[PDB]
Ligand binder design. Structure first.
Ligand SMILES: CN(C)c1ccc(C(=C2C=CC(=[N+](C)C)C=C2)c2ccccc2)cc1
Lengths: 180, 186
């Protein structure tokens, strides 16, 4: 089970959903095509299970890291820097978008997105309560921030990590200064 | 037209079935050609696709050339460029092929280098906006290169990762973004 999950995740990250075949998982995970079945049934269910684990791991990791930022302003900076460095969830976004632009309401996938946006919602709601900013539509600002940061993460993979952190911090500064 | 008919047919098939499901045997049979000849003009399925994107990219640039004339200030041009990126990607028939292609070859240094040259033309559009804006006194931005990359990546994140099917709400979110972003530059 655990060899199929690890190799699957890696191939999905490296090649996306379509280019990863159950045969290719079978060959590199030392297990039968019927071994993948029963444990996972289908390629889709294996991927969705990988996403469940990834988003739980990401959410665990953020629970621990957010104590390090005292203000919600600092938490926005921190969360966005961590999205670039984390091994969890963010590395799969290209596989996730592809899977999303193919699959049949499994879409009920939207509770995976709402979780990923909810970190910003807490940040922005709590910042509202602690007088750090005034935001009337937190739901909208949360979605905008999350998807914007996701674009900065996902579309700058080619680059040096220090420069990516520098671009991201400038984004965070512009964005927060724009809530003024 | 060996090369041009393969381009047209490949485009149709990429629209119809996406990048991954479309094979070179299909492209060549419907073009009345051969895989040896496809290999000759484009070497790979990957490079054939990249050539289509370059022709399409050129069409997008000429559209923006004539559409930006209706936005008086560079501030208005920023809002418009972002809304156009969104609405165009929403109906664009090659969009799914582009996503499939990108999500497969984004970590391949060979292809991913050529993807960057395409992407940089988008960032250049933003650079012109922000530079012209500096000159016109609409804002004062020190690193126009950084800000242009940030805008381009941020706008396309909003377009790609947003799941709201309602195009009205998507447009509203993008215009809010443009407002926040520009307000942050002051
Ligand atoms: C048809 N059409 C107008 C467009 C089509 C595609 C793009 C994209 C993109 C993403 C990031 C970019 N950056 C960071 C410069 C540039 C382009 C893009 C979206 C999803 C997957 C790959 C690329 C934009 C416009």
């Amino acid at each position: 089970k655990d060899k199929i999950l690890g190799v699957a995740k890696e191939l999905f990250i490296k090649n996306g959903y379509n280019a990863t075949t159950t045969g290719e998982i079978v060959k590199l995970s030392e297990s039968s095509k019927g071994n993948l079945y029963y444990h996972f049934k289908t390629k889709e269910n294996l991927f969705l299970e990988i996403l469940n684990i990834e988003e739980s791991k990401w959410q665990e990791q953020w629970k621990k890291e957010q104590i390090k930022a005292k203000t919600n302003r600092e938490k926005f900076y921190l969360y966005n820097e961590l999205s670039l460095t984390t091994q969890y969830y963010y590395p799969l976004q290209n596989a996730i978008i592809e899977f999303y632009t193919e699959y049949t309401n499994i879409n009920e996938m939207n509770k995976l997105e709402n979780k990923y946006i909810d970190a910003y919602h807490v940040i922005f709601k709590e910042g509202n309560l602690n007088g750090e900013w005034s935001i009337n539509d937190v739901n909208a600002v949360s979605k905008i921030a999350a998807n914007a940061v996701n674009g900065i993460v996902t579309f700058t993979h080619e680059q040096n990590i220090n420069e990516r952190i520098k671009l991201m911090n400038k984004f965070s500064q512009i964005f927060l200064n724009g809530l003024s």
